[PDB]
Design a protein around this ligand. Structure first.
Ligand SMILES: Nc1ncnc2c1ncn2[C@@H]1O[C@H](COP(=O)(O)OP(=O)(O)OP(O)(O)=S)[C@@H](O)[C@H]1O
Ligand SMILES: Nc1ncnc2c1ncn2[C@@H]1O[C@H](COP(=O)(O)OP(=O)(O)OP(O)(O)=S)[C@@H](O)[C@H]1O
Ligand SMILES: [Mg+2]
Ligand SMILES: [Mg+2]
Lengths: 408, 408
């Protein structure tokens, strides 16, 4: 219900990337790559808001992996700050060489959310990530992911990305449509959402309580499954349809699971269930303080919480095999990698290299479900101050409704 | 003569840094520092265009060097990208803790040059650096430096800084007022100035020719000294005064050094001498390819070229003791350090730590002459494209005038 006008306006886009300099760079590219062990010719150029992609056609034989490993050296020989090598460009035989624009224009949240893709999204938990390399809005749906793993080192834009996702939901769903459980071992990053009506419990700081929060989630998931079974529905959307039709028909449904034990008892009237999202700002700590029990709970939620409408968003600044385990990854195919420190760290999160070539400040590689190759997305910027406003707007529309059993 | 309108406009400054969040951060700071081995209390807050400085008053005893070493950990504990620790604040007993603003506003060249400090600067070689932490224009004078050393690692803003300095001169001085010798071993960064009338020779790429360029400079310096001696003047400003007064008096001076050897010979009429600037994009190579001969020439130019109106600007991306030797430093007190990789690298350039705590993208520590402490300056941004325009504007006002003896 809170107005999008609470956000900061989109900034001017004084672009101008004269075809002049673009031909020269194309020219330099071929020259510089040649000095290395690779023959190449520029096929086309695509200027964007943050980067410019120069599609190139390698000579037969040359291993594209060879170009990828030359990224550092090529950027140097070109005197540019960074270079991202795109090994394969969907639908083409060309290789991508992406180069940062001198004056990159920031991508504002208000800009992404003002897109029809978002304004008309039906999901209860859409996530407006940002703009793609051509500047087109990239709006996703957490419900279809159906879980998300997020990594990136300091200054990469992980926390801003996490806030953009929380605000995507807060701008489209009311507390009866979506509820959240936030886990933030340190105080900082997520402490500000404290109090909004969407919260199921206060921001979790204690790791043991974090563990309980996941157990509660599992319990609620199985509880929703018994409900859906008793109702003859396959998922949350179906459940909510049934309950909604019965009401509109002047015949509200009664909890088919309620067992009367006292003459006094009356079956409670069913109501639509909210989509639940569990967001962990940093779960490397959980995986360290608690351990195996945490993996177990995560792995269980990931495997079957989708139908129950319970979704996980796990973010980590420490992308190690100890934190992002194969057990965690096996049931969470959707990945988002902001800038990471090494190719090794890139593979742990994406099972692929490349996130080490990102710029930082929101720059990311998004790996949607049933996709082998990630698409580059320029994370939308949302300031802690904008977060504070929306949060205040929500604390005015409803008081906190914590359930002191979740952390118990 | 080329119009400032050739530059890009200053971008909006949607700031807003509510005193709210500033009190909280002041609050966290004391909290977080306490967790480390340091008691502290915030005395005041000064929000700026790029950073916000929180002055703090350490408890008696605690070593300010202790806070400096905690910058990394402190930034981490605060969940911010970077923290700069200012050990002493001129005229105060406080210590500075500088924190980057979420949405930093870029500082545009047009904005700095539009300041009266620049527009009314008399020097032939003023260098508009950018904005200080409070957003005030910092315009310097190369002639009073009288030489400048510049360091910074990749993506720090060294080359943008060097272009802003070259354009500072190109927007105030005509070729009869200022001439340049550009040395750029690689092609990239400085190759674009090729052809402007100000150039004394083509952009130098060969290291041996770079060596000759420096020798020519020494020769020209001594030649100007004999000229000034013969004219009874102490410096270039004085020389140019004399030659200018004589002309206005209908009596142009004659080269007092010209020795007639033929009946044919006629003493040439003197003319005002241009201020000469030698800019090396990367002299780490020179110091490596040639060696000791290059140190010697640099050391000689640095020691006595000021009066002769000849000035050096030496920039390096590889700040090692092998490159920035004490010999070089003894005669070049003015320093500019953009972000560097380590405290060691910071000491090599500033003989002090701190450049390792910079943000990059133009952020710098400027050490003016007769000063022990550097002032933070947010470098003014100038795109390669803006440089291209100004270059074209100059190539229309004058043809190249190379002296094929300088590199010979
Ligand atoms: N999408 C973005 N667009 C522009 N700047 C961004 C973006 N995301 C992040 N930044 C910059 O980085 C800051 C926020 O970074 P975070 O998202 O908190 O980074 P982090 O990866 O969580 O690591 P930290 O700094 O340790 S919190 C902002 O204040 C900006 O200055
Ligand atoms: N003063 C500045 N303001 C904003 N962005 C800047 C500034 N200086 C540098 N940048 C960014 O960095 C780029 C230029 O960096 P350079 O100044 O060439 O860096 P460098 O330190 O010389 O190292 P490179 O990238 O190896 S050339 C610009 O294209 C911008 O994207
Ligand atoms: Mg963070
Ligand atoms: Mg450079």
């Amino acid at each position: 219900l809170p107005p999008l006008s609470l956000l900061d306006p989109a900034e001017v886009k004084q672009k101008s990337y004269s075809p002049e300099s673009l031909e020269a760079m194309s020219r330099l590219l071929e020259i510089k790559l040649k000095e290395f062990g690779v023959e190449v010719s520029v096929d086309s150029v695509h200027p964007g808001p943050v980067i410019t992609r120069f599609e190139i056609q390698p000579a037969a034989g040359v291993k594209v992996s060879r170009i990828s490993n030359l990224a550092k050296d090529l950027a140097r020989s070109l005197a540019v700050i960074s270079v991202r090598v795109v090994e394969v460009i969907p639908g083409k035989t060309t290789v991508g060489i992406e180069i940062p624009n001198e004056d990159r224009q920031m991508v504002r949240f208000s800009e992404v959310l003002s897109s029809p893709e978002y304004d008309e999204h039906k999901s209860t938990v859409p996530l407006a990530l940002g703009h793609d390399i051509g500047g087109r809005p990239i709006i996703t749906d957490l419900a279809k992911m159906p879980h998300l793993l997020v990594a990136g080192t300091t200054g990469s834009g992980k926390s801003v990305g996490v806030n953009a996702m929380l605000l995507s939901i807060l701008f489209k769903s009311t507390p009866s449509e979506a509820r959240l459980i936030m886990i933030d071992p340190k105080m900082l990053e997520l402490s500000i959402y404290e109090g909004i009506p969407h919260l199921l419990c206060p921001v979790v700081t204690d790791m043991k309580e974090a563990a309980n929060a996941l157990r509660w989630s599992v319990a609620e998931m199985e509880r929703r499954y018994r409900l859906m079974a008793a109702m003859g529905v396959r998922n949350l959307a179906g459940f909510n349809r049934k309950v909604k039709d019965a009401e509109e028909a002047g015949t509200p449904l009664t909890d088919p699971l309620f067992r009367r034990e006292s003459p006094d008892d009356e079956p409670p009237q069913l109501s639509t269930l909210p989509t639940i999202v569990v967001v962990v700002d940093e779960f490397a700590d959980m995986m360290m303080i608690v351990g195996k029990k945490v993996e177990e709970l995560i792995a269980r939620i990931a495997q079957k919480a989708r139908a129950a409408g319970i979704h996980l968003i796990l973010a980590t600044q420490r992308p190690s095999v100890d934190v992002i385990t194969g057990l965690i990854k096996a049931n969470i195919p959707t990945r988002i990698a902001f800038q990471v420190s090494s190719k090794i760290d890139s593979r742990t999160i994406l099972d692929q290299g490349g996130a080490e070539q990102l710029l930082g400040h929101g720059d990311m590689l998004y790996l949607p479900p049933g996709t082998g190759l990630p698409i580059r997305v320029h994370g939308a910027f949302v300031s802690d101050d904008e977060v504070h406003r929306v949060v205040e707007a929500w604390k005015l529309r409803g008081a906190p409704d914590y359930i002191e059993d979740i952390l118990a």
